[PDB]
Each structure stands twice: as C-alpha cells, then as structure tokens.
C-alpha cells in the first residue's frame, strides 16, 4: 500500500505553486485551466467538508490539513470536521457541506451532495496527469510512453488512447500489461529495444522506472507517483520538464469532475 506519509505533505502550498508554474510552462494553462478544459466546469467557492478517517492504518498527519490548503488554493470554502468517520460525516452534512471529501486506505472520494456526482481519486489523478502530458506545447509527435498501468495508470492510458495519441505502455506485471494491451489497443513497450519520447506518463510507487534510453532533451515527465521516476542527474542531463505533486492536482481533478 503506497500511501502518503506526513513528510510528503510538508508545505503543500509551496509544492502546489511550483507544480502550478510547471503546468503553466508546459501546457500554457494552469491547473485550474486544465481542469476547466477537461471537464468544462468552474468553481463557485463551494462548501467542501473534509472528514478525517481512522479506518485501516488511520489518520495520516497533514492529510486533512493539506486538503484544506489545496481546496483554499483553488478557491473553495472548505473546512475539516472536529469528529472523524461517521460522526465526522454527520458533522459535515450538518454544517452545510455541499461536497464531502474523505478517504480510507483503498478509496479517496469526492461526493457532490447537490448533483449526486462522485469522483474516485485514482481515475481522476490518472486522467489529469495524462491530460497535462498530452497538452505539452513543444511536442513534435503524438508518441506517449506510459509506465505503470494500475489503478492510476490504466485510466490515464485510456484517456490518452481516446485522445487519439500513439500510446506505448509498460508494466512490471505482465498480466496487467497484456490485459491493458488487449483492452486499450496500446503498443506493448519493450525495454530491450527502446525509443525516445517527448511525452512520458508514469504512475508507479517506485524510483528509477524511466531509463535514459527513453529520454529526449526537454521531455515531459508527468508523474503522480512517489517518489521520483527519474534520478536527479538524469533530470538535469536532459532538462526534463517535471510535473509531480503529492495530492493537490488529483484533488483538483476530483473536485472539478463533480462540479
Ligand atoms: N500524486 C497524487 O496525487 C497521487 C499519487 N498516487 C500514487 O501513484 C502511484 C500509483 O498508484 P496506483 O496506480 O493506485 O498503484 P497500483 O499498484 O494500482 O499501480 C501501480 C502499477 O505500477 C506497476 N509497477 C510497479 N513498479 C514498476 C516498475 N519498476 N516498472 C514498471 N511498472 C511498475 C505495478 O505493477 C502496478 O501495476 C502510487 O505511488 C500512489 O502513491 C496515487 C493517487 C494520487
Ligand atoms: N496520493 C493521494 C492520496 C490518496 C492515496 N494515495 C492515499 O494516500 N490514501 C490514504 C489516505 C488516508 C487518509 C486518512 N484516512 C485520513 O483521514 O487522514
Ligand atoms: Mg496529485
Ligand atoms: Na514512481
């Protein structure tokens, strides 16, 4: 279970600002602009109730506080309930929450009580990070490499295929790889004979998943994964334009997806 740790969420504002500027530099739009382009929707400072959950491994330090800052950053009227779990859910609804935002170890959801729409963090994160990669201004071809085809990677790959991109996929689990290639029609990437990419989407909980033989100078690496798919040196060597942020972007995707 590759879950957030409290230290991933240290000064979430500075992380989200730098990611926002990176998205601006890469796509020409900010995270808000991406969300608008994706869902055709906009914020109206909605009231979102953040409910801490003690289920499974329990409350993660900085989690509900980071969600508060993220929602505030995107101009939402958010609050964290005093009580957790069902008691916290009750408090949220009582205090006039329009969107409930809550997570256990397997599901992080956003539920708009007004319109009945509900978002899952995994597909929402996959779609937005793939969307950002796809909107790279300085891309010469529609070739996109996807590494990691799990709960985040598969929806992201699907989104790229549906946008008529040439999608190359790899996953260390070949069951998931062969199940992805048949269901999506993606070209199975072979690391034995690689090619260079200008657009790369990685959704893996591991480091060093993107080899040097895959990189081209100024390429885009869009990755929600923790830690970093590429080494510090390989990032400098190829001046890789990096889109990586622990919570805010995927949360923005969830919120705008239910508006
Ligand atoms: N930054 C954000 O906003 C968010 C980040 N995440 C992170 O994204 C990552 C992926 O999440 P999920 O897709 O739910 O996990 P998952 O386990 O469903 O998918 C990960 C996939 O990557 C594959 N993989 C692992 N190591 C690999 C390697 N060395 N080479 C190729 N493939 C490899 C696995 O076989 C698996 O299919 C996790 O690290 C998670 O913490 C998740 C949600 C939001
Ligand atoms: N990466 C974006 C966050 C989704 C997921 N990767 C995760 O860490 N889920 C665990 C969250 C558990 C929250 C906890 N129950 C709390 O309320 O603090
Ligand atoms: Mg994110
Ligand atoms: Na990774």
UniProtKB/Swiss-Prot annotation:
Keyword NAD: yes
Pfam families, per database record: PylD_N
Gene Ontology BP term (one): amino acid biosynthetic process
Amino acids binding NAD(+): 151-152, 171, 206, 224, 226, 245
Keywords: Amino-acid biosynthesis, NAD, Oxidoreductase
Domain of life where this protein originates: Archaea
Amino-acid biosynthesis among keywords: yes
Associated pathway: Amino-acid biosynthesis; L-pyrrolysine biosynthesis
Main EC class the enzyme belongs to: oxidoreductase
Chain residues that bind L-pyrrolysine: 4, 53, 60, 103
Enzyme Commission (EC) number: 1.4.1.-
GO MF term set: oxidoreductase activity
Reactions listed under catalytic activity: (3R)-3-methyl-D-ornithyl-N(6)-L-lysine + NAD(+) = L-pyrrolysine + NH4(+) + NADH + 2 H(+)
Function: Catalyzes the ultimate step of the pyrrolysine biosynthesis pathway by converting the isopeptide (3R)-3-methyl-D-ornithyl-N(6)-L-lysine to the 22nd proteinogenic amino acid. Is able to use surrogate substrates such as (3R)-D-ornithyl-N(6)-L-lysine in vitro.
Family note: Belongs to the PylD family.
The name this protein goes by in its record: Pyrrolysine synthase
Organism: Methanosarcina barkeri (strain Fusaro / DSM 804)
